[PDB]
């Protein structure tokens, strides 16, 4: 029922700003407070600020002049706006809901906006279809793959047959091969389904707005 959906680009150059929108559903901003918290790769949770139900705000002292949080109750949206970002502002940013007593807990959180602060320019991924080595045995299981090579920054979303295939899917975490990320994804389907029918990995790099589909064909 209750969700906080986040939308923010990701790539910010040093000394420039960050803007993230938290769109809520299943509750009203007139009844709940919305907090903003971040998590740096080498640290834990850092609380940044909050906009309470009444429109009142509070912030961590070091952030008063660089961070603002405001809202539009009618649009069910909370806006996070931070200026003068530096390299150590690179983190996953979250909006979290918190009610008044007896609902005074950080129950529901947004999935997070990945923010990377660097001078580096965006690099779209090169997506390669991974077909098996040997041929499949009559009536068996086959594992097809998708290599998502050399992209900057994080994240990337991989789906198979536009999200229709999920049960036999595994999407692996990335490696950092000299300032570029590479990850893989695989799907396991029966031999009666492939190459008889079409299996396609759909890769999206939101931080470059490229959407690529690569059909898996026999080697």
């Amino acid at each position: 029922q209750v969700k906080l959906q986040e939308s923010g680009p990701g790539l910010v150059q040093p000394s420039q700003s960050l803007s993230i929108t938290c769109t809520v559903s299943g509750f009203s901003l007139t009844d709940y407070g919305v907090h903003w918290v971040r998590q740096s790769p080498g640290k834990g949770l850092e609380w940044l600020g909050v906009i309470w139900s009444g429109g009142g705000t509070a912030y961590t002292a070091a952030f008063i002049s660089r961070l603002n949080i405001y809202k539009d109750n009618s649009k069910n949206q909370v806006f996070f706006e931070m200026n003068s970002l530096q390299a150590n502002d690179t983190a996953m940013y979250y909006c979290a809901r918190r009610g008044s007593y007896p609902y005074n807990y950080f129950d529901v959180w947004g999935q997070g906006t990945t923010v990377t602060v660097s001078s580096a320019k965006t690099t779209p991924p090169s997506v390669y279809p991974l077909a098996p080595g040997s041929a499949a045995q009559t009536n068996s299981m086959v594992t097809l793959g998708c290599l998502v090579k050399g992209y900057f920054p994080e994240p990337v979303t991989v789906t198979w047959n536009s999200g229709s295939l999920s049960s036999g899917v595994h999407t692996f975490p990335a490696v950092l091969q000299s300032d570029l990320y590479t990850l893989s994804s695989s799907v396991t389907v029966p031999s009666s389904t492939w190459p008889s029918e079409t299996v396609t990995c759909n890769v999206a790099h939101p931080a470059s707005s490229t959407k690529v589909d690569k059909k898996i064909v026999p080697r």
Binding site: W47, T60, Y128, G145, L147, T182
Partner: protein
């Protein structure tokens, strides 16, 4: 501002009672600090566990209780379960701001053992047209999350080109990982046997390839 200190990590076996602490650097933690506890699960998913007045959200198990023990805040888990493996964060209120502690990673031992499922993938034809060749070795369904990956080209151990991920959790609480072997188009044409040897709990399972 104030630093909130928590134990770095704790390790328990199922059914054990554990107490995680949350300490304030500026003095005693009191009810006016309204100590909250939040749980972080794999893939950066956060959920509230305990509220400002030691109240649990609907659906949070009764084994989780918040309290003040002397000068600090505490989270008692009365009978640790496998699903409680996570990172626990406390948050303290200081009149006009919240401060989160550094988090306590809880590891729960004695979970069912499972050997890895390995798959070795050959480089794409579309990749060889850019004169590059990457071999992917996917490691799936293993517990404990500790694995060593060794690569061989015709039986000869490889030096460079290899990069391996640190194991992370799957949807079924077991672990996954992947290992790459970035090579050149010409080096791929010369050698014939490629082996991805995955070592887990002293045992090795391997997948080979031949063009």
């Amino acid at each position: 501002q104030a630093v909130v200190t928590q134990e770095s990590a704790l390790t328990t076996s199922p059914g054990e009672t554990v107490t995680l602490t949350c300490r304030s650097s500026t003095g005693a933690v009191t009810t006016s600090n309204y100590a909250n506890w939040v749980q972080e699960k794999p893939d950066h998913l956060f959920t509230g566990l305990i509220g400002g007045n030691n109240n649990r959200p609907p659906g949070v198990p009764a084994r989780f209780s918040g309290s003040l023990i002397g000068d600090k805040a505490a989270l008692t888990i009365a009978g640790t379960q496998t699903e409680d493996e996570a990172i626990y964060f406390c948050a303290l209120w200081y009149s006009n701001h919240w401060v989160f502690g550094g988090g306590t990673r809880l590891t729960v031992l004695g979970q069912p053992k499972s050997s890895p499922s390995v798959t070795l993938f050959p480089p794409s034809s579309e990749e060889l047209e850019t004169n590059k060749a990457t071999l992917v070795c996917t490691i799936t369904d293993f517990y404990p999350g500790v694995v060593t990956v060794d690569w061989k080209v015709d039986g000869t151990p490889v030096t460079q080109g290899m990069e391996t991920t640190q194991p992370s959790k799957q949807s079924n609480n077991k672990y996954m990982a992947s290992s790459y072997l970035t090579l050149t188009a010409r080096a791929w044409e010369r050698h014939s046997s490629y082996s991805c040897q995955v070592t887990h709990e002293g045992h090795t399972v391997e997948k080979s390839l031949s063009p």
